[PDB]
Design a protein around this ligand. Structure first.
Ligand SMILES: [Cl-]
Ligand code: NA
Ligand code: NA
Ligand SMILES: [Zn+2]
Ligand SMILES: [Zn+2]
Ligand SMILES: [Zn+2]
Length: 279
């Protein structure tokens, strides 16, 4: 009985059932996408734990219930007309019995394309287009502002800390890489381009970190103590970028994401942090 989405065929997008064009009660089970749906003025009745822990996005979804993909009863009771999942979810069959499902395979469309793709699915092209135009202009302007500080050839490395582990990231695996490498067009060290960019991420032992850091490093973490032992180490303190105060420590609870709401916060945060590196 719902007016239907035109359900365009788009790389990475799979539809289960007849997707509504104008869903009124959306459950997002994919934190990668929740804020895209919010930007397009969807009514989110269910979101994920990650969404509730995202201090920027959470402010806009207070009325949504936190749910996990296993919460068949809670999701049913929310009476959704659309469920959104990532393609690695394992109970899509059961979810699609509750409501139509859109399943997205990560990385098939880039962080900007995802928004315009949802614009086509929901006939919200104008909202997507306006946001994307503003983003293009603003990021070009900000690229000039930050390269006025660093120079145009400065290298950046994206890093994240989790538990006792260290990771590097490329241009399209979160942690600020989309803004640093795609929006600001900062280069990365050669070793990062060669070893990290294709896969998107790389597990590293701490002792080799100096070899992967050039001018600047952006480091994501979920709490301000995860990195404490690393930061006090002689190894870390030996790195030229560290000596120069070219370390930018960011809050992973928002910096994991690439939705428009998270990005707006990240963009201003990174712009200000690059300026502040020269205080
Ligand atoms: Cl932050
Ligand atoms: Na966590
Ligand atoms: Na500023
Ligand atoms: Zn129950
Ligand atoms: Zn550029
Ligand atoms: Zn400096």
């Amino acid at each position: 009985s719902k007016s239907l989405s035109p359900m365009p065929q788009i790389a990475g997008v799979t539809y289960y059932g007849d997707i509504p064009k104008q869903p009124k009660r959306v459950v997002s089970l994919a934190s990668t996408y929740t804020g895209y749906l919010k930007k397009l003025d969807m009514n989110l009745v269910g979101v994920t734990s990650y969404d509730k822990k995202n201090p920027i996005l959470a402010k806009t979804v207070k009325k949504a219930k936190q749910v996990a993909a296993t919460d068949l009863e809670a999701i049913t009771t929310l009476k959704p007309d659309l469920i959104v999942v990532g393609s690695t979810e394992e109970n899509i069959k059961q979810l699609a019995e509750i409501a139509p499902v859109i399943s997205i395979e990560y990385r098939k469309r880039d962080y900007l394309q995802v928004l315009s793709d949802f614009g086509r699915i929901f006939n919200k092209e104008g909202k997507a287009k306006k946001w994307l135009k503003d983003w293009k202009t603003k990021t070009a302007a900000y690229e000039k502002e930050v390269k006025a500080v660093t120079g145009d050839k400065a290298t950046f490395t994206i890093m994240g800390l989790y538990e006792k582990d260290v990771y590097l990231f490329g241009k399209d695996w979160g942690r600020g890489g989309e803004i640093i490498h795609q929006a600001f067009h900062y280069d990365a060290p050669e070793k990062v381009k060669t070893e990290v960019f294709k896969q998107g991420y790389l597990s590293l032992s701490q002792e080799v970190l100096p070899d992967y850091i050039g001018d600047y490093v952006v480091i994501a973490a979920e709490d301000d103590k995860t990195g404490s032992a690393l930061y006090e180490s002689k190894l870390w303190q030996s790195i030229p970028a560290v000596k120069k105060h070219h370390v930018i420590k960011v809050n992973a609870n928002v910096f994991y994401f690439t939705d428009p709401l998270s990005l707006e916060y990240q963009l201003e945060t990174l712009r200000e942090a690059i300026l502040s590196s020269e205080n």
